Amino acid sequence: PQPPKVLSTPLEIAANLRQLQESHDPLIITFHDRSHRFQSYVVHVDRESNTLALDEMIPRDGEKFIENGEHFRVEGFHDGVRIAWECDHALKISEVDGHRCYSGPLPQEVTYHQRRNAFRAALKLSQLVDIILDGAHLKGNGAMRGKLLDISATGCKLRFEGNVEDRLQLGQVYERFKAGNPLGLVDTMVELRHLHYEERINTTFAGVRFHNLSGQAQRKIESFVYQLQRE
């Protein structure tokens, strides 16, 4: 679990906002009591002037709510961290070289949340590792063949052809998980944490957590994770 850090100083607040800016990290703007989510970007951060400017709404019609001076929440990711805050102040709509933006004071507080205990390295789609998901509590007939999509020191993301939801159970433990080269995992225990089926591409994705791993198994998983980002 663990809740997000609450950043409450102009120094920290501006530093994180500058990162969203310099990286052009997309923001999702949600207006109070309005379903639709709009997109923006941080385009100006000036701590001395206590000024923050957001990029023109997308869709453009959302600018209407800023004119209405409606309250909204803003959230964006930077290097895996969810940076979020509330804007309850009136913004000024400005236009520079045709590009418009909304500027106002820096938020008094910003939340900083990153929930994963270990970095997940994604595998190139052209180099997916073959895996087998199996165990005594697996429903249906036979072990399930699949592919490894991402992996961290603590778990991994798997891919299975077709819909396999009914053959699995959230929270269930599978003691016969295997992974081919270059991991060479055998008789590994994994616990299903999340899954969903995507009809459009007839694929079920699942997130599992490792359990009771030997040192050798850990060093092998961790060295792969390390190597995956080496490239």
Largest sheet: 6 strands, antiparallel
The rough form would be described as elongated
Structural class: mainly beta
Q: Name the CATH homologous superfamily of the largest domain.
A: predicted glycosyltransferase like domains
Side by side, the strands of the main sheet go 1-10-7-6-2-3
Write down the CATH class of the largest domain.
Mainly Beta
Order of helices and strands: EHEEEEHEEEEEEEEEEEEH
Number of contiguous helices: 3
Number of domains: 2
Briefly note the CATH topology name of the largest domain. Thrombin, subunit H
Radius of gyration: 23 Å
Tell me what portion of residues adopts beta-strand conformation.
Answer: 35-45%
Helix content: 10-25%
| Strand count | 17
CATH architecture of the largest domain: Beta Barrel
The N- and C-terminal alpha carbons lie at a distance of: 31 Å
PDB class: unknown function
Keywords: c-di-GMP, PilZ domain, unknown function
Assembly: monomeric
Entry title: Crystal structure of P4397 complexed with c-di-GMP
What's a concise summary of this model?
The protein is built from three helices and 17 strands. It has helices at residues 10-22, 63-67, 215-230, and strands at residues 5-7, 27-31, 37-40, 42-46, 51-55, 72-78, 81-87, 92-96, 99-104, 110-113, 121-122, 129-133, 144-151, 155-161, 173-179, 185-198, 203-211.
Descriptive overview:
With 231 residues, this protein is mainly beta. It has helices spanning 10-22, 63-67, 215-230, and strands at residues 5-7, 27-31, 37-40, 42-46, 51-55, 72-78, 81-87, 92-96, 99-104, 110-113, 121-122, 129-133, 144-151, 155-161, 173-179, 185-198, 203-211. It folds into two domains: 1-114, Electron Transport, Fmn-binding Protein, Chain A (Pnp Oxidase, Chain A, Roll); 115-231, Thrombin, subunit H, CATH 2.40.10. It contains three helices and 17 strands. The protein has a six-stranded antiparallel sheet with strand order 1-10-7-6-2-3, with helices on one face. Strand 13 and strand 14 (155-161) form a beta hairpin. Pfam families: PilZ, PilZN.
